[PDB]
Amino acid sequence: HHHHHHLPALKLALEYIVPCMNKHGICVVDDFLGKETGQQIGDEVRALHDTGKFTDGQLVSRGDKITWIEGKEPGCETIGLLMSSMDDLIRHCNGKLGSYKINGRTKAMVACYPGNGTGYVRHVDNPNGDGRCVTCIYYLNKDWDAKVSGGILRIFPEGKAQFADIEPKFDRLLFFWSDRRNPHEVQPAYATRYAITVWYFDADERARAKV
Numbered sequence: 001h002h003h004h005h006h007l008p009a010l011k012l013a014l015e016y017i018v019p020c021m022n023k024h025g026i027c028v029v030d031d032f033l034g035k036e037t038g039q040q041i042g043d044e045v046r047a048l049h050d051t052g053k054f055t056d057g058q059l060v061s062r063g064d065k066i067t068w069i070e071g072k073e074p075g076c077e078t079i080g081l082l083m084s085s086m087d088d089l090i091r092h093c094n095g096k097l098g099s100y101k102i103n104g105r106t107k108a109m110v111a112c113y114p115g116n117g118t119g120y121v122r123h124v125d126n127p128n129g130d131g132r133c134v135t136c137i138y139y140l141n142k143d144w145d146a147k148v149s150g151g152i153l154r155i156f157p158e159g160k161a162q163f164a165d166i167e168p169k170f171d172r173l174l175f176f177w178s179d180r181r182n183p184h185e186v187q188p189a190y191a192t193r194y195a196i197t198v199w200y201f202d203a204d205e206r207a208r209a210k211v
């Protein structure tokens with residue numbers, strides 16, 4: 001609809017992402033890339049699935065299966081654009097996300113929960129200070145109905161009187177602190193559920209992790 005207009009990355013970062021993250025440690029952004037780009041990502045992810053590029057998560061350690069995407073691979077061009085779009089937002093968050101100085105990230109982890117009641121038990125992404133400070137997730141599930149299909153990400157922010165229910169909605173982008181501040185679970189999914197995750201590194205924590 002031609003009455004709607006995209007917020008520039010700088011505007012979205014400073015007017016929303018930064019304050020929301022510093023206040024709540026969780027930030028949801030809907031309509032990130034638009035319908036055309038979102039569906040195209042859906043196509044690329046389904047292709048990865050169909051061509052058998054996923055490994056079951058019980059080997060990586062949960063009924064998930066995952067594939068790592070660098071972004072430049074043939075057939076992953078749009079996933080690549082998503083990743084550069086994520087980077088753009090983080091860049092504009094300057095050094096305003098707490099006291100972090102982000103200088104790098106993981107590749108993209110494409111995850112599939114193949115319905116059949118599969119999910120992910122309550123966990124912390126980075127409990128052992130491995131350098132990862134911000135989790136960034138993009139969902140690409142067309143017309144997801146959590147009332148029927150489930151698959152809600154429930155986040156339990158540490159020491160807060162509230163929790164967050166995040167439906168894995170088409171074209172939804174999500175940020176949260178990767179550390180113990182945000183334990184979270186993926187509730188059982190009863191339809192094919194896809195997500196793409198990148199983790200951003202804090203320079204010092206990442207350095208102290210391997211050094």
Ligand SMILES: Cc1nc(C)c(O)c(C(=O)NCC(=O)O)n1
Binds near residue numbers: 057066120168186
């Ligand atoms: C560490 C880890 N590994 C996998 C495979 C995940 O799927 C998640 C997660 O929190 N997923 C959240 C979501 O998809 O809404 N975390």
Ligand SMILES: [Cl-]
């Ligand atoms: Cl508020």
Ligand SMILES: [Fe+2]
Binds near residue numbers: 123124125184
């Ligand atoms: Fe997680």
